[PDB]
Structures are given as structure tokens and as C-alpha cells.
Design a protein around this ligand. Sequence first.
Ligand SMILES: *[C@@H]1O[C@H](CO)[C@@H](O[C@@H]2O[C@H](CO)[C@@H](O[C@@H]3O[C@H](CO)[C@@H](O)[C@H](O)[C@@H]3O)[C@H](O)[C@H]2NC(C)=O)[C@H](O)[C@H]1NC(C)=O
Ligand SMILES: *[C@@H]1O[C@H](CO)[C@@H](O[C@@H]2O[C@H](CO)[C@@H](O)[C@H](O)[C@H]2NC(C)=O)[C@H](O)[C@H]1NC(C)=O
Ligand SMILES: *[C@@H]1O[C@H](CO)[C@@H](O[C@@H]2O[C@H](CO)[C@@H](O)[C@H](O)[C@H]2NC(C)=O)[C@H](O)[C@H]1NC(C)=O
Ligand SMILES: *[C@@H]1O[C@H](CO)[C@@H](O[C@@H]2O[C@H](CO)[C@@H](O)[C@H](O)[C@H]2NC(C)=O)[C@H](O)[C@H]1NC(C)=O
Ligand code: NAG
Ligand code: NAG
Lengths: 492, 119, 654
Amino acid sequence: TVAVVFSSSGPPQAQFRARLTPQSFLDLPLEIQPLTVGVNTTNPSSLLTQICGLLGAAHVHGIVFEDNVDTEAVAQILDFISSQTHVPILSISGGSAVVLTPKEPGSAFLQLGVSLEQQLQVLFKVLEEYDWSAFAVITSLHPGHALFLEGVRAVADASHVSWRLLDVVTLELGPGGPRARTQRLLRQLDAPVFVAYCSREEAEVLFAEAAQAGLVGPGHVWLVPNLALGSTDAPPATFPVGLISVVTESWRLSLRQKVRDGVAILALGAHSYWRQHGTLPAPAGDCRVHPGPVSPAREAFYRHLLNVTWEGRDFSFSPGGYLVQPTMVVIALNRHRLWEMVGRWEHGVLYMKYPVWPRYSVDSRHLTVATLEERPFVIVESPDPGTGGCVPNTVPCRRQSNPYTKLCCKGFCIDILKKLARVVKFSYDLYLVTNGKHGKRVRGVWNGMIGEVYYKRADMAIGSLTINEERSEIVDFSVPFVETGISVMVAR
Amino acid sequence: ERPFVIVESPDPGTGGCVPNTVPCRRQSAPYTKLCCKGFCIDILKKLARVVKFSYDLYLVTNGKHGKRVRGVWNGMIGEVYYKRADMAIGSLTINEERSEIVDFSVPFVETGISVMVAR
Amino acid sequence: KIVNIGAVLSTRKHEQMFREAVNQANKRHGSWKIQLNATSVTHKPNAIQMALSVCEDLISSQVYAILVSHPPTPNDHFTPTPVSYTAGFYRIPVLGLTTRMSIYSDKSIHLSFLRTVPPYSHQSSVWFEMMRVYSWNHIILLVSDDHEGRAAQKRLETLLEERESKAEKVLQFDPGTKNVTALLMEAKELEARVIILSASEDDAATVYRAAAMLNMTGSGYVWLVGEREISGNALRYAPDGILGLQLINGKNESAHISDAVGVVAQAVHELLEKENITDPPRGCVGNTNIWKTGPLFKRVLMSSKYADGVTGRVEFNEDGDRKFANYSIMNLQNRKLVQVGIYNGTHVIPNDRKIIWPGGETEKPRGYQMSTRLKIVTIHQEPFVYVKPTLSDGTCKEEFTVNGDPVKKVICTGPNDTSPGSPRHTVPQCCYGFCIDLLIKLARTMNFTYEVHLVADGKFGTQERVNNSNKKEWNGMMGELLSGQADMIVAPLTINNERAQYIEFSKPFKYQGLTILVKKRITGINDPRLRNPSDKFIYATVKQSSVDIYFRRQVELSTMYRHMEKHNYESAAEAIQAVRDNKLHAFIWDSAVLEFEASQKCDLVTTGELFFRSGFGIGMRKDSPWKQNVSLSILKSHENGFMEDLDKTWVRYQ
Ligand SMILES: *[C@@H]1O[C@H](CO)[C@@H](O[C@@H]2O[C@H](CO)[C@@H](O[C@@H]3O[C@H](CO)[C@@H](O)[C@H](O)[C@@H]3O)[C@H](O)[C@H]2NC(C)=O)[C@H](O)[C@H]1NC(C)=O
Ligand SMILES: *[C@@H]1O[C@H](CO)[C@@H](O[C@@H]2O[C@H](CO)[C@@H](O)[C@H](O)[C@H]2NC(C)=O)[C@H](O)[C@H]1NC(C)=O
Ligand SMILES: *[C@@H]1O[C@H](CO)[C@@H](O[C@@H]2O[C@H](CO)[C@@H](O)[C@H](O)[C@H]2NC(C)=O)[C@H](O)[C@H]1NC(C)=O
Ligand SMILES: *[C@@H]1O[C@H](CO)[C@@H](O[C@@H]2O[C@H](CO)[C@@H](O)[C@H](O)[C@H]2NC(C)=O)[C@H](O)[C@H]1NC(C)=O
Ligand SMILES: *[C@@H]1O[C@H](CO)[C@@H](O)[C@H](O)[C@H]1NC(C)=O
Ligand SMILES: *[C@@H]1O[C@H](CO)[C@@H](O)[C@H](O)[C@H]1NC(C)=O
């Protein structure tokens, strides 16, 4: 027996029209026994009485829950009730999709969500793909703040990379009035990569304060776990374009999608243990008698609900009540103010749809740098053997065709520019040219690096480029640093 | 002592003295600041940045390096063993007689007993 | 503006006491601007109906703070769960008069909660204080698998890492189990001699009886436990001499009432004036929303500095801890308890008469049972360690030296008779050298007993992130030292930063550096032939050495590693033949042995001077008891010309 319940929604006729008749998902190896209950705006007393009365009257063998505006502590009521009455319940929806690390020794909650550890793993893989290599953490002491501060270290410290972490900052804000010192504290910082952790309204006030402070430019990138930005179906205001957040497979999700998932998985789990010397289970007693002090052999049936598979998507579980080895995607906000697919982690290594970050939008950063590989000065080399992030003491460079293959460049001017950027606090990317080596004013049109700088397609030029009257007419120059000349090479 | 440490009077023209030097008091009401720079002084400076702590420098008055007379200890070792000071830096040697009453760290300047004569 | 609060209780007599206490505490102020009130209910068996009763209490009055206690029922962990969960939906503050369980300390699952009695974690801190009293630094942490166990282990780990000396082989056993003898027998080998336990009462009795069967409660040793390990029926299995401690005035909680209302009084008259308080959440049905000022009230109450309750000055911590509660130390003085110490936060006062340890000795017993037969590991090195095959009579050549004095030799086991390829041949060889004489002197001075054996890897050992990615475990000899295969290391071993974390070194006894070897000439590290490697000249070193790390951590010199990693003999003095084979020209290695090679052999020349300074030294495991003495001994030898005489005898006449 399987039952469905929802706490709040829009037009409720659709759920009853698409879930009542026992023909929904009639493909699983079990004749599902469905029955419906419901409830208006949720309160602890109303929820408790309604659901355990439904259990005591209909004696169903499992329930699935659908959620609402995503309150903060409903899951506590849920697993308390589950432990008290000893029935394996399941929930897949917005606010209930939060993990609870300390479980009770007798509860069967079994949510569908991922812990912050794997989220940080995926996010750090995302960062290593782009290889920004310099991050700082800014956390507000929201609920469960210490777990994030532990997990960031536990993940970043052990990998075959450097991860030159900048610093950690802790914030507290009551946004209405007490945010005075927070302004200066947020002004003080300096880092190229930011990773945040807070709630949605707290995110809105924090980003407003950041915009007031000024550390929002495109030369900085924000990273936020799935705890915030819950309202995917609605792009909120005062949010900066081009941040990265990571969510599980939920683009196909809806009311009907969750309905089709839940009952099917529960029935298949009910039948899998029967497949080898099993019998159909029976419900628990009631919410009144407080029975069942011991854990019978039927608890293994709950243990039988660990391994599961359907529809190609792996729903492999974990001993704590969550799923392990999951399929999940990484998202971002484009210029149209709407969530768009950016990448995913399909059990292997990261994928991509935009191979370069478009930094879309005057006293800005990330200036364009165009160069050419002269023999001793700027040296271009093929990437690392298998990784992609080239050997240290090198800078990634990208030759364009306007196959943007990633090469690694190192040399004299490379280190010069690295020191210069480290001393004047600017960010850069290395771009090569295709139209000629240096370029001349043939037919009154400028090609090469000089032409690229002239046409404002590249803000700077570095490398083997001499000085003379011809080029100095239209392009500025700096103080020379290598005394060159014109000489004659001959034999001995 | 030897150029391992250098003591100088503060520059009277400019009031104090030049940077790259650490103020030091020769306490024996007797405060009259001098300023000290050298080898071990630079080690302690550079050294202070990395652990992270804050300190002062007072010179030694009674005794040079510390020897037991009638069962008492003076000098550097006395000033450290009577809990009047924490560490003794400069030109201090390691042997069996000293290391039984005071802790010692790793060595960074090797030396021994040497003989000098005319040319 | 009648401010109303409530408090649920257990015995219905403490309810009348609470009513009297609150109406008496109302006499603090009566200015008619603010008034107080109370409402009390009693407990019930069923959890769900009890929570529904809490909701009825919630609707019946726009409450401000609920208070909870424990009934005489023995159902401990099932007592306070429902009220916190239900009242947390509206950020209603809840005050737990008495509940010591660890889980409630987390403000992320019970986000609204405040406690007056500290959880079981904090008492661990007391142990640390006691641990500093009598200078004990090697521990055996025994703990269960429950959440309280993990909390205690974490708390002790951070408190140890404050001073950051060490922990020693923590081991956890499953809860509610029998025959725990396996773990105790496994851990009985270690040199530590003090244990710490904190688990269930029945588990305490089980471990007590198991240790009695294994004979661990005897003399010399000492192990102390937490609070509930000396209660219930655990006394029926406990031996004399085990330390114990409890809280000064717990389990009464009636006086605790006299505190709680106090602080909440000290809260209410300080909150009603902030800006816009005006309401608590009224109702218990339909009103799906939270209190607009709940966090503000909770935060203001948390930082309250109360003056004087019954149980001294009471404050709160960042999460709601007791903030300097009291503790009394009792001894199992012949199946009874005697209050021997008072812990109030900074120390424990030994104001009592006498403390009896499990051994019956009335003096302070130290741990660290000193072993007598060590497990010495060594390595083949030309001028320091000589290894030879034995004569089948039972030893090797027993004969005089140039001076006529007998050269002392030992018998060391070790290798597989062939380093590159062989299954194994663990055979005894005869074993004599400079370091062997130094070890003989050390053993004569400190009454030792040695069993020398060589390494199987044939290499010193560096950090290696193996293809199975994990923490880079130490290689070969160092892994043998750390894993417990060996106990002390005597060899020409360098002293570097990368090794100082896990090992304790003695004072260096021979200063030495790095030098080049060629067979003639050459120069130091300045020539373009080394700045830009040439196809003619080949520069190679010994693989898995400290020089590998040295060349693996230099920014500018990185490219030389690119050459060095290309071809370097993963070898030993055998690679010396490379310079004899005219294949490898330059050999960069340590100064002493390579210089002795020049004197002993011929046509081999050393060029220039050194370019690095280090030293050899005896190493041991982290904070071993011997260190000081051993170091002192070495220094004393260096005073008596012993080192100079050994230098002369072994490497002078050549
Ligand atoms: C993973 O999920 C699968 C999906 O149902 C479950 O299968 C388990 O597989 C074990 C493997 O042997 C089976 O155990 C049974 O043991 C009895 C002992 O007499 C034997 O007669 C049976 O032929 C069978 O081998 C069984 O199918 C099932 N385990 C149990 C306890 O029923 C299971 O839920 C998960 N796998 C494991 C190992 O828990
Ligand atoms: C619980 O604590 C209260 C207060 O500490 C105890 O009441 C005190 O008892 C002593 C000795 O009888 C009296 O001198 C005090 O005047 C009492 N104080 C009050 C406020 O009544 C009480 O006895 C304790 N109960 C238990 C069972 O330990
Ligand atoms: C807690 O008890 C200890 C020991 O009984 C007290 O420690 C004394 O505090 C004074 C300062 O008041 C200091 O001189 C020493 O730390 C202790 N005196 C001695 C050892 O003679 C402490 O004051 C008590 N109260 C606390 C820590 O609040
Ligand atoms: C370190 O050396 C000291 C002194 O050599 C040792 O202390 C001696 O211990 C023996 C037996 O325990 C006593 O008979 C001596 O009287 C002690 N010496 C003194 C001066 O009291 C100490 O045991 C050694 N420790 C280690 C770990 O080897
Ligand atoms: C005060 O408490 C009594 C206790 O029963 C209750 O009847 C009354 O309604 C309460 N009044 C207010 C204003 O809280
Ligand atoms: C179980 O207990 C017996 C007691 O006779 C003991 O000999 C045996 O080693 C124990 N087994 C384990 C695995 O501890």
C-alpha cells in the first residue's frame, strides 16, 4: 500500500486527476495500491493529527510527501513522527530536501537530496576545470554554519592541486539596522573567487550590501550551494548575473514527476525483497499506543530499500538517509535573468556547454591581453599529459580562430606580466593572433597585434614588439625594459 | 658580544635611530634606550614574524655567560633559570653542564674550540 | 502589558513549588508597568498526545518561554524531544532544566534551546586539567559508537590540538555488545599506561569484567571514567582506585527552578523596551508563521549576565552551555566515594587527605612503561655500516684490528639477499661499523638490549602519493618506523623540516653537507652545462632521498628535477660503479661518505666545497620518553673526545 500527501500547491485538481486512478506508473513489478489524503496550510498539530489518523484509519504501507513555501523545521516533525509510529515515509520536494546529519536510532526518513560535502566536491571540480586557483570563503553564521567551515577544509586540503586559499571571513547581519560594521568588514577583503553560504533573503541583503561596497565586478565570481536560491522557477531581483550554483537532476521535476517517481520506487522496493523468499509487508500500529520498542526482522525490509534502480537514473542510497553516487548538474544565470543549463557531472568528469566564461555586463578588470610566441621570450607548449591544467610555473593561453584548444604559455614576458599583475592587482587572460606575426600597414590597414590593439579588440599587447615613430603615432607605449638593436649574423 | 649582536647609542641628531634596528634597554629609573642590530637580532626579527609574538630586549648586567659559584647561577642562564626571562639569544654555547637545567633548541651556527697564533 | 510565561514539570509537587517560587519571584518588581504569570502541566507516557498537550498549552496562552524537566521514569533520551520540536516552529524559547545528552547541544536541529547544566562533552575538559596536574602525556582513549562518543572524541581532539602534543590510537567499539576482549587485547600491547572511558553503564560493567578477566585492573596502571560509569550497577563490577567525578548539585533541579525564573526575569524587564516587541505568536493552528522577534529574544537572553542564582554565578556559552559549572572529584576508596577535589574552571584543588591509586602505592605513579628489548632498524652505508656474510660456524671473522683491539660486531637479519629481483631470503648477516660502536656505547650507558634488522625496501623513504590516491604515507624505512615495525632508528639520517613533524630528533653528532663526485675538473652549481643540461654530461643522484625533496621544492631549480627524474639510479653504493663505468659523470651526494670514498679509492676526485649544511642524528617516535637522556649522553661523549677518537680510528688512517 502507498499513499500520497501534499501540504500546499496551486490548482490542486491536477494532482487528484493524475494520481487517483490506479493506472499511474502501472509498469513497476507490483500492483500499486494508491489512496489520497490532503491538508491545507501546515501547522505541527494539524500535520501530526491528520497524518497519524490517516495511518491509523487506512493502514497504508508507506507515504510520500509534497511540500510548500519551505519552512525551516518541518523535517524535524516528520522524522519525529516516523520514529514514534515506525513507518518508512518518503519526501521529495523543496523545503523537506534538507539533510539531517544526526539521525534518530529508529527513524526511517530517507529524503532525496545530497549533503554539503558532495556539493562542495562538485563545485571544486567546477573551479578546477576553470582553474582560478585562488579562493576565499565568506560565511554568515546561519543554521549549521560550522559544518560548511569544516567541509570546505576537509575537501580542499586533500587533492592533487595547490588550492592557495586566501582567507575565511564570518559575517553577522540583522539587515534592518545593525549592518554598520559589516559594511567595512566586507569592504576590507580582496580575492578573485568568492564562495558564499546563507539564506535567500540573507543573500538578497548581502548582495545589496556588496553592490553598495563595490566588490561585485566581473573579475570576481560567486559560488553558492543549493541551500540558497531555492526558487529556481522564479528569478529573483537584485541578483548579479553570472553566478554558479549546483542542483541535482530536477529540470524534469514537477508535481506529476514526483508523483510518478515516489509510488513507483516505493512499490518496486516493496517487491524487490519479495523477489527472493519474501512476503508483502504490513503497516505499523498507530500514533497512540506507542508500540514497537524492539526492531523486528521487518527492519531489514527497510534495509532492503537501500539498493534501487530505475529509468537509467541511479538512486543509490546512503546509510544516513540520502543518496550516494548521484547525477546532478551545475547551473548559472545568463543575461536574460533566467536559469540556464551550464554543465553536469554524469558519474565521470565535468562537461561543458560554454568552454569560456563570457563575463557579460569603465574602471573594470579582466583586461584582454594579446601576444605572440617569440622564440626566447614567450614560449607556447602543448598541455599536460592527461589532466588539462598544464604544468606549474605556466599560464593557460587560448588561441582563437577569429577549436579553441587550451595551450600553456610560459617565458620571460609571462613571468613579467605575472609579477606586474600581482603588484597592481589585476586579472588577465592570454590570447594569440592569427593574421600575420607582427603586422604592417600594407594598403593602409593594420593587421597583427598592433592592428588588434588599434581596433580596440584587445586592450594590451605584450612580447616581442619594438618601438619606432611609425607605430607611436596612434598607440601609446611604456618605458622600455630590454635594450634591443639591429645586428648582422654571419659565419665564423 | 661579537658581530652576532651589535649595540649602538641612538642617533642623537634624529632623536631615535635608523630603522632595521630593534630598541633595547640596558636595565641594571635606570632606563636609557639604546638600539641593537646584528645577526641574532635579525634572526629574532625575521623569526618573530613567523611564529607571531611580541617581545623586548634587555641586556645582561652581572656575569658574561654563567658559571656556578658556590652553587648559584648568573648571567644568561641565571636570568632564564630564575624565571626572570623567557629566552636567552646571542652567542650561547651548548654543553652537558648547561643542558641539564635549561632547554635547548636546534643549532644554526656551528662552532667549537679553535687556536689562533701569529703569522 | 501582562507578560506571561509557562513551565511544564513532572511530579505535580514541584509544580506547586514552582507556582510558589514564581509568585515569590514576582516580588522583584511591582511597578504596574510589567507583570508576570505562570501555568504548569505534568507529563504523560505517549509522545504524540504529549506534544498535542504542548500545542494546547501554546494556544491556551500567548506563552513566552517553556521550561522542561525530567520525570522519575528511566526513559532518558525519549523525554525532551517533542517539546523542542513543536515549539521550534515558532522560535519559542525552551529551557531544559536537566538533560545531559550531547545531541541537544547542536543549535541546527533544535534551533531554539537553552540549558543550565552542561552536556557530557564539557567534563572531558576537566580531564585535560587533571592530565596536566601529574604530567601524563600518553593516553588510551576508549569510547563507544554513540553520538555522545563522537562528540567526546572530537572535543578531546580539539583540546589536545590546542597544545598539540598527540593522541594515541583511539579505538571505538559498538554499543550494547558482549566480548569486547578483542579490542582490549589488541590495545594492551601499546606503551601507554592510562585509559579513558565514557560509555553506557551496562557497557561499563561489561568492560570492567572483561578487563578483570584480562588482568588490567592490577598495579601500576590507572584509568578514569566519566560521570555515569560510576553509577547504577557499575559499582558491582568496579575495582578500587579508579577516579570519578560528578556535578555539585545535579538531579535536584528544584533549586534549578530558582535559577531559571531568575534569569528569565532578568530578561523580560530588559526586552519589553527594545523597539516593537508588542506580541508573541498567538494560536496553535492555522497561523503558519514564526514570531517576528524570536531570534532577538533568544539572542538577548543568551548573552544575559545573571548575578547570583542558587548554583553560583551562571552564564551561557556561544551555544548555551553551563559556563563555569562546578565538579566534585570522588575516589573509589574501597567501594565508596570521597570528595577529593573541587573543579571550578581553572584547576582542581587537592584539599582532601589522600588518594589511592589502583596499584596500592601511595605515590604518584607515572605511565609510559619502559621497554627493555628495542627493535633497531638500520641501512647499508659504506663508511658507517659494514655488513658481511657469516662463517658457517655461527658468526664471522673474530680477529684483531690494526691496533689489535677487537672490532665489535653484532648479528643483524634483514634483506632478501638481492635488492632488484628475488622472492625473499631473510638470512642473518654479521654487522659492524661506526654507528654500531656508538650504539654499543649508548647501550652500555643506558642498560639497553638490541635486535638489529635491516630494511626490505633498500631506500630511506620519502613522501609518495601512490596511484591509489590518498594521504602520502611514508616510504620504506620511515614507514617501518611509524607503523610499529621498528622502535628506534640509528643511521646516517638527515634532519629536515619535512621529517620533523612526526619524528623527534636528538642533537646532531656530525655536521655534513652536499658535494659533487667525478672521476678525473668540475664546479659547483653554476655552470651552463647544469643550467642547460647537455647530452654528453649526465647528472644523476640517488632516488628516494632527501635531495629529491630538496630539488622538488625549489621554484627556479624545478627544471633540474626534470633532468633528475629522467634517469637517476634507484640504487646505493652500487651506483658508485656508475662513475667507474664512465656513464654517469657527476654524482651529487652527502659530503662525509663521498669524501671517504675519495681517500679510500683512487682516481675519484671531489671538486670545490659544499653548498648545503645539515646534520646526522638519532631519531625516535613522537615524544618518546628516552629523548632527553639519549641526547644528553651524545653530548657528553662529544665532550670527552669520544667522537674525535672514533673519527680518527675509522676514517683518519686512509
Ligand atoms: C541490495 O539490494 C538488493 C536488492 O533486493 C538486496 O539483495 C540482497 O542480496 C543478498 C545477496 O546474497 C541476498 O541474501 C540472501 O541470503 C539468503 C541467506 O540464506 C540466501 O538464501 C539468498 O539466496 C540470498 O543470498 C538477498 O537477495 C538480499 N539480502 C537480504 C538480506 O535479503 C539487498 O537489499 C541489498 N544487498 C545486501 C547484500 O544487503
Ligand atoms: C535542592 O536544593 C535546595 C536549594 O539548594 C535545597 O534546599 C535547601 O536545603 C538546605 C538544607 O536543608 C537549607 O539550608 C536551604 O535553606 C534550602 N534552600 C531552599 C531555597 O529551600 C534542597 O534541600 C535540595 N533538595 C535535594 C533533594 O537535594
Ligand atoms: C576557582 O578555584 C581556584 C582554586 O581553588 C581559584 O584559583 C585561585 O585564583 C587566584 C586568583 O583569585 C589565583 O591566585 C590562583 O589562580 C588561585 N590561587 C591559589 C592557587 O592560591 C579560583 O580563584 C577559583 N575561581 C575562579 C577560577 O573563578
Ligand atoms: C633518564 O635519566 C635519569 C638519570 O640518569 C633517570 O633517573 C634515574 O632513574 C633511576 C631508576 O629509575 C634511579 O635509580 C635514579 O636515581 C634516577 N636518577 C636521578 C638523578 O634521580 C631516568 O629514569 C631516565 N629516564 C629515561 C626515560 O630513561
Ligand atoms: C495567568 O495565569 C492563569 C493561570 O491559570 C491563567 O488562568 C490566566 O489566564 C493568565 N493570565 C494572563 C494574562 O496570562
Ligand atoms: C570471547 O570470549 C572468550 C572468553 O572465554 C574469549 O576467549 C574469546 O577470545 C572472545 N572472543 C573475542 C572475539 O573476543
